[PDB]
């Protein structure tokens, strides 16, 4: 299914929460009245990451706009997935190793193998 | 131009904070790791879109190119969710 990544490698309460977060995301994206000016991550900085690639030429305004949204979702879901491991260790501080553990639960994150070995 | 490769850490950390309960702390190294992960998310997908663009001799990477790359690379859920957002933006 197209939504397999939503809870891949998750069980129990963690599974339900990430699924619910994705439903929240979807409903938000289906919404009208979007302000395409306000983002947690600046459109200019997103575009600069894209342009760091010498193969990239021109970029439609659509592309950073989509990344702004996608990156929010990415940070949030990975942070939530990482938090499971912090709670499993009875810790209130999220550590790098928690992110590493979260990544290993889903092959969607294989692209990060060099970023977080 | 080197610093262009990574999104600002303060913004990333802010999103992380909102993803966690109010009482949670985030380690310095966790913030930095996340900054690197989400920055790679952009570059990884963009590279896929860019090569398809180059192969087709097209000059502009557009919204559809990002969605196409997302599904090609196994981010099908991102592609489907953001297709909604893209069509709304274009109406």
């Amino acid at each position: 299914g197209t939504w397999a990544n939503v809870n891949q490698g998750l069980q129990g309460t963690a599974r339900d929460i990430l699924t619910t977060y994705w439903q929240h995301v979807i409903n938000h994206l289906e919404s009208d009245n979007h302000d395409y000016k306000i983002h947690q991550l600046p459109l200019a900085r997103i575009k600069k990451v894209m342009k760091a690639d010498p193969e990239v030429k021109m970029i439609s305004a659509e592309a950073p706009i989509l990344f702004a949204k996608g990156c929010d979702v990415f940070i949030t879901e990975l942070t939530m997935r990482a938090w499971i491991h912090a709670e499993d260790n009875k810790r209130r501080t999220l550590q790098r190793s928690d992110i590493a553990a979260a990544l290993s639960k889903s092959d969607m994150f294989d692209f990060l193998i060099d970023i977080v070995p | 131009k080197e610093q262009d490769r990574w999104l600002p850490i303060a913004n990333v950390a802010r999103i992380m904070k909102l993803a966690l309960p109010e009482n949670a702390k985030i380690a310095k190294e966790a913030k930095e790791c996340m900054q690197e992960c989400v920055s790679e998310f952009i570059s990884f997908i963009t590279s896929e879109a860019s090569e398809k663009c180059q192969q087709e001799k097209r000059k502009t990477v557009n919204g559809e190119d990002i969605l196409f790359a997302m599904t090609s690379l196994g981010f099908e859920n991102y592609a489907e969710a953001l297709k909604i957002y893209l069509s709304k933006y274009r109406e």
């Binding site: 760091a52 690639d53 092959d107 969607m108 294989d110 692209f111 193998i113 060099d114 070995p117 | 080197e2 490769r5 790679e40 570059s43 990884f44 590279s47 896929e48 090569e51 090609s72 690379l73 196994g74």
Partner: peptide
Amino acid sequence: ESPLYVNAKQFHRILKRRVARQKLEEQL
């Protein structure tokens, strides 16, 4: 730790990103 096979949809782009990153690191 270091798998031979990774996500089939991602593998080739991972290799291409490694090459691109090496070029960026040469530039410094």
